[PDB]
From Swiss-Prot, chains A, B, C, D:
Span within the parent record: 9 to 232 of 269
Bilayer topology: Multi-pass membrane protein
Record topology, Cytoplasmic segments: 58-60, 75-82, 146-155
Compartments it resides in: Cell membrane
GO biological process: ammonium transmembrane transport; camera-type eye morphogenesis; carbon dioxide transmembrane transport; carbon dioxide transport; cell volume homeostasis; cellular homeostasis; cellular hyperosmotic response; cellular response to cAMP
Extracellular side: 22-38, 102-125, 174-178, 192-198
Intramembrane residue stretches from the record: 61-74, 179-191
UniProt KW keywords: Blood group antigen, Cell membrane, Glycoprotein, Membrane, Phosphoprotein, Repeat, Transmembrane, Transmembrane helix, Transport
Extent of motif NPA 2: 184-186
Protein name as it appears in the record: Aquaporin-1
Chemical reaction(s) catalysed: H2O(in) = H2O(out); nitric oxide(out) = nitric oxide(in); CO2(out) = CO2(in); glycerol(in) = glycerol(out)
């Protein structure tokens, strides 16, 4: 266990990153002409949410299933009041995120035309002021898992860890609208690592910090 | 509590309005040319249904999850026979609806081309006679939550408040067909408040009143 | 009760027929030019499956939720061996189906261009030999509800009557491919009643009879 | 029973193959011109996942619902350590797969234009090196059912065999991207049997063997 959840965690994210990119890039590949699809990226949404549940994150992990950066942090902070010690799973997550973005490459990059661009760069058209969207989309999932963990004795009766996989699935469909491609950090860090140009602004990282911070203050406005 | 459910309620709708508009307007934004999508508004459907469930409307609220105007009223009326006192949650809802439409603006409006048109105006092509559709789509959700609250001991066994989020999700896909954009009141009031032209006819508000009234009379045709 | 389930049943189908047609016709309505969509009819699928569940078919009805013609019959036959008396719900269903197709008209027909064509006529391109598809799609739902009613003590644990609403939702997406528009009888009878041309061949009705007959013989190949 | 699960198994796959092909080919059929759709094959995903659940694979079968080749094997191997005897269900599956691809033909082939091409041949553009994708998509389902069977006492509470039907539904949407059409063996064997050209490379069969082998080694990295 002194390393197990971490490896298992690194394992998940890894495939998730390959899953997402597979779907995102997949478009226009043969020696044909442009087509451009919008229902593809919405597919990325679901897929990513499924790979998460497919983890069997029961014993193999801890009460929280797969957790992307911003989320990872968001939960451990609101879950830790009396004290402030639980960064391990965070470090674990980021690490696993890095490797995930390492394996992503593969044949995809070899067979692509000069200009692939694995991910966004300036998302749509808006100066460093159009970062409000991603902020709201971040408290969604953050709040989805928060709510899911809190309310219990009087909610439903049991279903399956798809709940989050579908909610994050939609936040994605809302964020990837035309600007803000790359909700959480991970997905974008590994994008700017290989075949990049650097000018990520990590604007998307400064978002969730305020967002996840906002969804934590809002959830405290309930009980204790 | 002498204000809590109201704030919590105002809170929900708020984000929901930003969620919906985000998805609806999101289309054609860059300095590119027309494209026009129809699978986008269907996305609005789901998204809106998710933000509702994401509320954890257990203790934080009362047995009914988020409730849009027409619905809000529809339930409290059929739930209240012996007497007629339970308008508070209604006032609460409308209020929260107003603020929701206030925050909607944001960067969206600043970066849009002169003619945005946040929402419908005369929905498709039909005089003040083409309001039957929205009426039927309104008793759907109204009846979804009504049925969900009534039948219990012999129904299923427990799932999650997505049920309504998917049913309303489809009513939307049926209403937003080409005419009647803006099922419930809320979404349209806040639309005609900022950057408008006034000629909403609130036709959509005169609908649900008859619709929700119809689904209440039809549900009485069962037990008591 | 000497009429209740029947009225309640007539009630359901009614709205379902209006729901479906609303979605099917909805396309290309304004004074614009052609566009033709294929993701719309797939919407019809889900919608129809939802209106079914929205029935609260517990006490108000009997163990089988809404049931379209071919299905209606299919269940009562396999459910009745020792004897052969349970046609009442069948007559009920067809009747309710007729009224459903009566109200369908409305504004839709008034504002449409000469050539609406509420439904199929010769579905795609194939003589009276291309009826195998609809046959297979019919045993799907028929078998969905059959299986759902049989296996119990060792299956899941309880969910919601969406199961059928999604399975029929897909059979539809498979049938309405390009030929065989109008899975069960109902939907097509009411189509050829108003603004028709008569040449339905009811081929779709001769299908399910063999189909539902086939799925009944196949389910007997299990226990007893 | 000395033949029952096998017939029942042959039965399932059969319809599944007809289901899938129905959806895949369905596009561009009338005497009209090209259109080419991408949201159709994603429909194949779900449909296939539904026909599986529709099996009522409780007593009629064994703990594993329908199981396609690669999967069939993948489970029986990880389920059998102490010994190595449980190939019967495997032989059964492949057999049923063969007949499934026999009935697939039908009217479809008679009314199609010379060049139908029931399935892929060289999937997209990539030498015998672009087989990594299908490998990853294979451990998905393989791992979905593996995880679903393992973790129990602390997971959810009961739902329905759609879980796999939706996960495989997405793996499909990820694989059928543009290359690797035909996830598991079955679907492709029966494709190269009727109206073929032979040059399948079964590359897709050499994949899952490594994939399913990989997902078995990864799941052992947990408990025992």
């Amino acid at each position: 266990l002194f390393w197990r959840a971490v490896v298992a965690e690194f394992l998940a994210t890894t495939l998730f990153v390959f899953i997402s990119i597979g779907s995102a890039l997949g478009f226009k590949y043969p020696v044909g002409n442009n087509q451009t699809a919008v229902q593809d990226n919405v597919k990325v949404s679901l897929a990513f949410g499924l790979s998460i549940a497919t983890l069997a994150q029961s014993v193999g992990h801890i009460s929280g299933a797969h957790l992307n950066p911003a989320v990872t942090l968001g939960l451990l902070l609101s879950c830790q009041i009396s004290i402030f010690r639980a960064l391990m799973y965070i470090i674990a997550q980021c690490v696993g995120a890095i490797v995930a973005t390492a394996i992503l490459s593969g044949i995809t990059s070899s067979l692509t035309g000069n200009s692939l661009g694995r991910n966004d760069l300036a998302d749509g058209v808006n100066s460093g002021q159009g970062l409000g969207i991603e902020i709201i989309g971040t408290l969604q999932l953050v709040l989805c898992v928060l709510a899911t963990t809190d309310r219990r004795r009087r909610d439903l009766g049991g279903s399956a860890p798809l709940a989050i996989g579908l909610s994050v699935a939609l936040g994605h469909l809302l964020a990837i609208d035309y600007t803000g491609c790359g909700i959480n950090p991970a997905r974008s860090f590994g994008s700017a690592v290989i075949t990049h140009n650097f000018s990520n602004h990590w604007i998307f990282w400064v978002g969730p910090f305020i967002g996840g911070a906002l969804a934590v203050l809002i959830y405290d406005f309930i009980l204790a």
